[PDB]
Write a protein that binds this ligand. Structure first.
Ligand code: ZN
Ligand code: ZN
Ligand code: ZN
Ligand code: ZN
Ligand code: ZN
Lengths: 356, 445, 293, 31, 417, 196
């Protein structure tokens, strides 16, 4: 039963994974990461303290966010002494934000938190953002109280008017205003206010925010965005970069004004045209054609082959059949491959091999 | 040190013998694996093309960052004379050894090989039941007798002759016994791969008038063989050598066909723990080992008190440490044995101690000491106790007519490093017995 | 310094090599590649004794693991060679014999789409398995493709191959590609090598292939940072339009689906997601540059 | 561990000004 | 408000503020606006976020809080005050400001004033602490005690307003106006002394009540419902997501710049099958030595090219002297800034900005002349030793500028004539 | 003592006053501070105007602090006369009625914190004499009072409260309450079939 207990839990874990529909997701994002640095963040419930762990996971989130959302941008704000302090402008450079977070890691948190000040600052940072982007604010909250100079309800109404979306990660318990902010802003959904229960669950919560948010059916901002695919040049003598005005050896040439840029993806400093590589778009294709989940095969029927289709690992004999099949191609897969086929790879090897 | 030791031996051999050593592909396929990764890369490039490539072309392949590795690779490749530098037409051209080239081509492309890898009788034996047992016991006997633990079946004179003739296990007829030495504990501290290479390397130097190449045609070829299978029987020298190799637990013989053993494949390439022990502040030892080899080596510097099937419990004492030191075992080696055979519990607690130390003050990074420092300090102090009294054999020089002469003779002794003590006021000095004759001869002249 | 796994993906198909033989004057060049590959795999097993080998052949109707053979023999190579070399070569040739027999049986079968993408995905899954099992191994993919035979449409290969690049970039698996055929460049596989620290080579003549394999595609993962790759082509990391099939340097991509477009789509509607664009917004793109009146 | 040790026993300012003058000229121009 | 594109471009005080502190921005402003002639309003059009970020830093204020409770006096006792706290005390207590504004410059200095304030009973009454008759207090501040009794009355009306019947406790006691029972015990009544007058603890209860009410009311500054609250939400239908789906069809034309029949395929596969079954020679793989040299030459040909790039794949060390290099960076930055503004207006699509395009086109033409003049000045000064190296450092920007002018001319030709 | 100063940092302090209108204003302010996240604390009397109809659900109540058993003033002539009358007529012991009177008010205040089944809060009875009145609490409250919580300390109550509040902030599994605590029309029909 103990081994069966593992099986049934595995089936229950798979139950959630069974439902996968090709939701429309906003690939081009514009995130504002708000961190809480107040007296309440000096506690020791998270080792060594709340401030240290939050900053560390923020750096990891920055790495993951820009890895899977290459054509997005991020800005970082913190709450200190009842004021909102800006530490990073909206930009597509993942290194600027990590450097800012590392600097923040030293100073001791103190004072009171102010959601209204942070929300107002985030509202202003997302003003010069195109209409095709998804304006999002991810607040990491640790306090149980808010000291604001004005009416927070008016700010919430303004946020809803500007089509900004708020996700809040609380530390100890539910705050009434945070629930309202995450609900009135997400079209009534109450799943965007998450309260962790341990260190491990926090890492999952940060990891979940990396993926793009599905869009609402009545919020239509469909448009064609003018992009550019520059050609990398290899030069013999250094040349000035049009973005930082410093000598670098080689850089991509924009096809609209021929000015060179150090790194991609960025908006060209001259023609204001986004420069990206084809790979940066290919990094998001798995969010538009998600691979349909694999369902275990009951032992009543007869199996096809003794070994895995893609990895040639013989299935153990053991109660519970250790086989998962792809309905599209009907090829059995080992339990190990299916995790790697749906998290690292995003194409079923069986489907590709089949000719049409 | 494994590849370094084997390579170092292969460098000292004269060039005239290296050319003959590459006739058999079996040996070539083994020498090729020991070179650095860059060396193998270049060697594989030249093997298949019958031309001469300038050195500058090889330099172009390496990136600026890895330029340093290109120096070691070329030096090691030239030392074995695998790569022949020929200079002509104003260019330092580089070529591969024709015999090495042909041998590698035969090995890779399955050409005629003259049974360099041997043959197969297709009469397999059971590896687990016999091969593992035979060599494990045979290797057990040599190590047990090495450690000094009493044992019923003593090994044959062949390995016994080799053991004494090596620095391992110094012996004296007047003493009538054999005891381990400084290098002896180091040898027991080395992995199976190096533990086997030390004996084989010593055997190579011991033999006289049996060719040196043939003894290498067997050892390197023995690596090519795969365990758990038969190989029919070869050179004349390789017959007696095969029987001699049988005493070290390398090859098993039923009595026409010989079978290599786990150790045979353990020679070519690489590949709770048994032997892990706990040392307390009470100078106690609890070893989680069930193997007479580990128990015997522990008995070198441990006063065993009792044993169970799962573990062995004893106590560190001054008598045991003095007993080990008298044999030439240095305290540094002892602590190395304790540290590298430490239980996971000691490691985890030591890590926590380091974490707390860094938690209060992260400025300094204290070393991670798995076992308590008091035991190490006490062991070293006992070593100092042995070093308390210092005595030299030599002569005292005195009654000098002139200060000039006293300074002249004493300064000369200092120059040649045989002066142990001097006093200007008394015009006296003491020199070691080793330098007596040189000082006397200089005095006359 | 460390053992490394080499996973060779060979694209053997009756249609691919037949056109190669007809366009040239070399008959049965696949044997030349096969014997060259056999020596190459033997060379890899001689670099170190702890490195394995995997061969995944993509035949007309699917993929098959030539080595290691599944748990479910003829003499082609002399039994006097080294044991480990033969143990991998004899099985390799035996599975080649079976595959050709199986492929010949379904010669009349209509195989329209190539199966290179699936083979590459299978190799990556094998790389993940091998690394997970033993604990401390490197990896490397080698794709031997015959590009002489004119392909039908490579567009469908873009999404799978581009997904292999990211996965290969996560596990530090440099994928090298060797092309024997007419076209000098393969736009998708060339990007695969450049984006994953790999080596791309194209050779017109099948003969003398071992020289290329031994000198160019022999860089193990341990010494990749210190060796400069000999690749000569330069890739631009560009993609073809969706309704004109021409490489686009500056164009339009739909925000919803991220499909490139060289020109504004007819009907002011995306041809991939059926999403209607705002007439006002697209009019912005149509505007001509501002010049004094 | 002290075993081996011996035993115990007995210029920007100009840039700012030209800016201030420049803005002073501006405000005069606007008024 | 003053957080919009318009006012931020017009708030000259703000523009001069962040430009004073930020030096790198000051570096470009001096070169591009003073000597170059670029208009100021154009320079800040592309830096709105910088202006807004610097404005939001100083334009936000902390929320109201009980300030006098945080003041712990802690024989001499030293209490520390700060400018922020002084302003907070004035904000939360208008009487303190009233007694402050009229006395600081007139009679005694501020240090004496605050020393008197804490010693006075006014600070004790405002702190929600029971005043002690024994305490002497301060003579001057006590004059405002009766005034505060008037401010509290004016504040009680500032808070009084009709209350919703849901939580109206006044209507519960007026539900039956003729209720006459037994008067409640002294435990259910406010405390009194022997003489019968109030002990005064209710006053501090009201004081803290008023402090909280004023703080909440201050939040709602210038800057149907009952039914919803009474309803049981848990018994209503669960929220349903309204996310849109997309189905991506996949079909596109192939990239645009001898057919073998099944019989030929079958024949060749038979040939290889026959060639494989019969025998396989691995030794044949070795080249003939006439192709090996060709292959090696081809491989090294590409290795040299790659090695040339790979040796030079914090700005990289440069050869030019520092003075010339800095002057080149200034010329590159100023030229690029004009390029940015020219394209922002050139691609605007509205013909009202034609004059600005003309002005920026002229500036770009002047930039070309300036680049040529710098090359000539270095050529004669340094004898072409650095001119060749100087021309390379600014080649890409020169090509971009001339391309911008070329495109301007090309579209001008078709459009105008 | 300075205890209030510590409370002022985390929440606003609203106090019940003899005046009804002022208390109503205090309730308005207390609710406002609870809604906007400022946090508020309301000090009231168990037998006062607040306890006789005002409900503190959802955010208006997440913790109830009953400071002592709300006993009447025993040295009251009216109460002593009533106690004597009940003892002789209805055979109700004086202590029994006094405890019943006190508990009917303590329970009265406890039940004003839950409106639906998605509402949660912590009820703490701070008195050593409460420890033996578990059998006197309402059945639905007594069933939720564990044997370990009968006599706790302040620290042990705080630790449990922190764990409980963290647990109640998690997304509830619908299947855990699909047909055992909340009924649809189909579930109700089933209950009518099995019973009959
Ligand atoms: Zn740059
Ligand atoms: Zn551009
Ligand atoms: Zn698998
Ligand atoms: Zn599939
Ligand atoms: Zn689209």
């Amino acid at each position: 039963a103990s081994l069966v207990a593992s099986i049934v839990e595995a089936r229950k874990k798979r139950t959630a994974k069974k439902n996968i529909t090709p939701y429309q997701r906003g690939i081009i994002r514009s995130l504002i990461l708000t961190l809480d640095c107040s007296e309440a963040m000096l506690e020791k419930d998270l080792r060594p303290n709340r401030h240290a762990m939050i900053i560390q996971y923020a750096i990891d989130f920055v790495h993951e966010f820009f890895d899977q959302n290459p054509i997005s941008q991020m800005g970082i704000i913190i709450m200190r002494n009842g004021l909102a302090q800006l530490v990073s402008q909206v930009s597509g450079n993942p290194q600027d934000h990590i450097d800012a977070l590392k600097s923040i890691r030293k100073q001791e948190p103190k004072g009171n938190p102010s959601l209204q000040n942070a929300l107002e600052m985030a509202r202003g940072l997302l003003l010069p953002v195109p209409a095709h982007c998804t304006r999002e604010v991810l607040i990491v909250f640790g306090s149980l109280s808010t000291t604001d100079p004005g009416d927070i309800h008016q700010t919430i109404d303004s946020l809803v008017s500007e089509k900004i979306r708020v996700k809040v990660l609380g530390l100890s318990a539910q705050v009434a205003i945070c629930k309202e902010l995450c609900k009135a802003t997400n079209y009534g959904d109450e799943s965007f206010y998450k309260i962790l229960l341990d260190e491990t669950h926090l890492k999952e919560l940060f990891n979940e925010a990396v993926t793009p948010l599905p869009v609402n059916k009545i919020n239509k901002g469909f448009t064609l965005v003018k992009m550019g695919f520059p050609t990398r040049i290899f030069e013999d003598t250094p040349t000035f970069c049009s973005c930082h005005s410093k000598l670098v050896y080689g850089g991509y040439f924009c096809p609209n004004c021929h000015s060179k840029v150090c790194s991609l993806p960025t908006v060209c400093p001259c023609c204001d045209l986004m420069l990206i590589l084809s790979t940066h778009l290919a990094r998001s294709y798995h969010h538009l054609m998600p691979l349909k989940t694999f369902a275990e095969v009951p032992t009543t029927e007869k199996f096809r082959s003794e070994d895995c289709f893609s990895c040639q690992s013989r299935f153990p004999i053991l109660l519970t059949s250790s086989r998962y099949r792809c309905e599209d191609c009907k090829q059995e897969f080992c339990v190990d491959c299916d995790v790697f086929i749906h998290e690292i790879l995003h194409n079923c090897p069986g489907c590709e091999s089949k000719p049409v | 040190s494994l590849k370094h030791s084997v390579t170092q031996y292969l460098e000292e051999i004269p060039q005239q013998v290296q050319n003959r050593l590459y006739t058999s592909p079996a040996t070539c396929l083994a020498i090729y694996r020991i070179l650095p990764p860059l060396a193998k890369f270049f060697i594989m490039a030249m093997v298949f093309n019958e031309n001469e490539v300038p050195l500058l072309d090889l330099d172009k392949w390496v990136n600026s960052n890895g330029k340093l590795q290109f120096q070691n690779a070329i030096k090691s490749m030239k030392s074995l004379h695998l790569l022949i530098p020929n200079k002509s037409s104003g260019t330092l051209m580089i070529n591969l050894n024709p015999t090495f080239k042909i041998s590698l081509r035969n090995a890779l492309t399955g050409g005629e090989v003259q049974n360099s890898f041997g043959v197969v009788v297709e009469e397999n034996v059971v590896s687990l039941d016999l091969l593992d047992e035979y060599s494990a016991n045979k290797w057990e006997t040599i190590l047990h007798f090495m450690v000094g633990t009493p044992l019923a079946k003593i090994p044959s004179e062949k390995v016994l002759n080799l053991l004494k003739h090596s620095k391992l296990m110094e012996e004296v007829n007047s003493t009538g016994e054999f005891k381990i030495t400084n290098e002896g504990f180091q040898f027991l501290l080395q992995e199976i791969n190096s533990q086997l290479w030390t004996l084989l390397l010593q055997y190579l130097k011991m033999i006289e008038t049996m060719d040196l190449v043939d003894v290498l045609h067997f050892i390197f070829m023995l690596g090519a063989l795969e365990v758990g299978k038969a190989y029919k029987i070869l050179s004349e020298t390789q017959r007696i050598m095969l029987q001699d190799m049988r005493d070290y637990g390398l090859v098993f013989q039923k009595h026409s066909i010989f079978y290599p053993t786990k150790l045979a494949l353990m020679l070519t390439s690489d590949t709770i723990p048994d032997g892990s022990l706990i040392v307390e502040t009470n100078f106690k030892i609890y070893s989680y080992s069930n193997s007479p080899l580990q128990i015997a080596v522990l008995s070198l510097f441990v006063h065993l008190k009792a044993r169970f099937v799962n573990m062995v419990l004893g106590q560190i004492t001054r008598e045991s440490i003095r007993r080990a030191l008298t044999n030439g075992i240095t305290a540094d080696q002892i602590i190395a044995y304790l540290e590298t055979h430490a239980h996971p519990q000691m490691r985890r607690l030591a890590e926590e101690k380091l974490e707390k130390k860094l938690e209060l003050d992260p400025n300094c990074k204290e070393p991670l000491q798995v076992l308590p420092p008091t035991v190490v300090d006490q062991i070293r102090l006992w070593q100092l106790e042995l070093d308390r009294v210092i005595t030299y054999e030599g002569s005292l020089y005195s009654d000098f007519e002139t200060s000039q002469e006293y300074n002249l003779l004493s300064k000369y002794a200092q120059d040649i490093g045989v002066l142990l003590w001097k006093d200007d006021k008394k015009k006296k000095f003491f020199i070691s017995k080793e330098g007596n004759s040189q000082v006397l001869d200089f005095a006359k002249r | 310094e460390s053992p490394s796994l080499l996973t060779v993906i060979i694209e053997i198909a009756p249609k691919l090599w037949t056109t190669f033989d007809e366009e040239g004057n070399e008959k049965g060049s696949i044997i030349k590649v096969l014997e060259a590959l056999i020596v190459f795999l033997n060379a890899h097993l001689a670099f170190n004794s702890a490195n394995k080998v995997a061969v995944i052949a993509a035949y007309s109707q699917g993929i098959k693991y030539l080595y290691p053979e599944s748990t479910s023999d003829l003499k082609i190579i002399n039994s006097d060679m080294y044991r480990r070399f033969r143990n991998v070569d004899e099985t390799l040739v035996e599975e080649i014999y079976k595959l050709f027999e199986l492929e010949k049986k379904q010669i009349e079968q209509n195989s329209q789409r190539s199966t290179l993408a699936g083979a590459m995905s299978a190799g990556l899954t094998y790389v993940n398995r091998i690394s997970k099992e033993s604990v401390s191994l490197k990896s490397r993919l080698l794709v031997l493709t015959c590009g002489s035979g004119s392909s039908k449409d490579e567009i469908f290969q873009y999404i799978p191959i581009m997904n292999c690049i990211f996965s290969a970039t996560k596990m530090k698996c440099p994928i090298d590609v060797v092309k024997i055929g007419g076209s000098k460049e393969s736009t998708f596989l060339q990007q695969t090598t450049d984006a994953t620290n790999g080596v791309y080579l194209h050779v017109e003549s099948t003969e003398g292939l071992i020289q290329y394999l031994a000198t160019a595609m022999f860089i193990d993962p341990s010494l990749r940072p210190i060796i400069v790759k000999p690749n000569h082509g330069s890739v631009d990391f560009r993609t073809s339009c969706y309704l004109t099939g021409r490489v686009v340097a500056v164009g339009f991509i739909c925000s919803v689906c991220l499909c490139v477009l060289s020109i504004i789509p007819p009907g002011n509607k995306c041809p991939a997601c059926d999403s209607q664009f705002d007439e006002h917004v697209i009019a912005k793109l149509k505007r001509k540059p501002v010049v004094p009146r | 561990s002290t075993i081996g040790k011996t035993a115990l026993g007995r210029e920007e300012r100009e840039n700012e000004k030209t800016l201030n003058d420049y803005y002073a000229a501006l405000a005069k121009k606007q008024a | 408000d003053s957080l919009s594109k318009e006012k931020l471009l017009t708030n000259l005080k703000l523009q001069q503020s962040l430009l004073k502190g930020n030096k790198v921005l000051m570096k470009v402003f001096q070169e591009t606006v003073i000597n170059a002639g670029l208009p100021p309003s154009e320079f800040w059009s592309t830096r709105i976020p910088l202006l807004r970020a610097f404005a939001l830093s100083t334009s936000q204020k902390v929320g109201p809080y009980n300030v006098l409770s945080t003041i712990k006096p802690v024989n001499k006792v030293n209490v520390n005050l700060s400018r922020e706290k002084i302003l907070n005390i004035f904000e939360n207590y208008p009487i303190v400001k009233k007694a402050y504004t009229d006395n600081v410059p007139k009679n005694f200095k501020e240090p004496e004033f605050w020393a008197r304030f804490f010693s006075s009973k006014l600070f004790r009454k405002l702190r929600g602490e029971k005043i002690m008759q024994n305490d002497r207090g301060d003579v001057i501040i006590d004059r405002y005690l009766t005034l505060d009794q008037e401010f509290d009355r004016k504040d009680d009306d500032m808070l009084l307003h009709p209350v919703k019947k849901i939580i109206d406790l006044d209507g519960n006691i007026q539900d039956d106006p003729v209720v006459r029972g037994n008067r409640p015990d002294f435990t259910m009544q406010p405390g009194v002394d022997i003489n019968g007058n109030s002990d005064g603890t209710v006053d501090i209860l009201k004081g803290m009540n008023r402090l909280s009410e004023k703080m909440i009311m201050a939040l709602k500054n210038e800057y149907n419902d009952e039914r919803n609250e009474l309803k049981i939400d848990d018994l209503n239908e669960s929220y349903k997501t309204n996310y849109a789906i997309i189905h991506l069809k996949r079909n596109a034309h192939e990239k645009t710049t001898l057919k073998v029949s099944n019989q030929q395929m079958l024949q060749q596969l038979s040939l290889v099958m026959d060639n494989l079954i019969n025998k396989l020679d691995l030794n044949q793989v070795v080249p003939n030595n006439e192709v090996s040299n060709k292959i090696n030459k081809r491989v090294i040909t590409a290795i040299k090219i790659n090695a040339k790039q790979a040796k030079h794949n914090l700005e990289v060390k440069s050869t030019l002297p520092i003075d010339l290099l800095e002057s080149c960076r200034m010329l590159h930055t100023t030229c690029c800034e004009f390029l940015k503004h020219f394209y922002i207006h050139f691609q605007s699509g509205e013909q009202k900005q034609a004059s600005t395009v003309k002005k920026l086109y002229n500036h770009l033409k002047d930039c070309i002349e300036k680049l040529n003049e710098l090359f000539q000045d270095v050529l004669n000064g340094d004898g072409e030793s650095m001119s060749n190296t100087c021309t390379a450092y600014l080649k890409p920007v020169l090509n971009s500028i001339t391309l911008a002018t070329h495109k301007y001319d090309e579209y001008f030709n078709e459009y105008n004539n | 003592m300075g205890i209030l100063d510590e409370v002022w940092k985390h929440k606003l302090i609203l106090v019940e006053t003899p005046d009804a209108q002022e208390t109503s204003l205090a309730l308005e302010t207390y609710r406002k501070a609870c809604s906007n996240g400022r946090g508020a604390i309301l000090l009231s009397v168990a037998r006062g105007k607040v306890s006789e109809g005002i409900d503190f659900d959802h955010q208006y109540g997440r913790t109830v602090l009953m400071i002592g058993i709300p006993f009447q003033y025993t040295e009251s002539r009216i109460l002593k006369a009533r106690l004597e009358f009940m003892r002789e007529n209805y055979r109700i012991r004086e202590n029994d009625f006094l405890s019943f009177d006190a508990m009917r008010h303590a329970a009265q205040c406890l039940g004003r914190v839950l409106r639906g089944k998605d509402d949660y809060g912590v009820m703490v009875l701070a008195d050593r004499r409460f420890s033996r009145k578990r059998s006197q609490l309402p059945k639905w409250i007594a069933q939720g009072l564990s044997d370990a919580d009968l006599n706790l300390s302040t620290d042990m109550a705080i630790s449990n409260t922190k764990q409980f509040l963290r647990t109640m902030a998690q997304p509830t599994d619908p299947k855990d309450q699909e047909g055992v605590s909340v009924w649809s029309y189909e579930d109700l029909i089933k209950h009518q079939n099995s019973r009959k």
